[PDB]
Amino acid sequence: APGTLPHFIEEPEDAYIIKSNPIALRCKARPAMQIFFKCNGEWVHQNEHVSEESLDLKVREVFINVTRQQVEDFHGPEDYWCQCVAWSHLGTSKSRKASVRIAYLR
User: Where are the annotated glycans?
Assistant: First the structure.
């Protein structure tokens, strides 16, 4: 009090690519002035982010597209993950790490 750090209304959920169709990672936080995705320790490019700002304090909603080509090119130790970082005047707030793996239908 009086200020508050960004509280996530919607956190990124674990998604699956079926088949070669791109997935969208939903993220919503309040109060937030900037919201950016951090996939596998590296910051995602600003042009890949689709922002949607509204007033209720400032509410921000950001969506990112993760294709099959992006996941297959990554050959790390664990599964392909994406985390949401929201900015405010007092600081930052990190959401849960959402995993994205390529699936195959029966």
Answer: 65
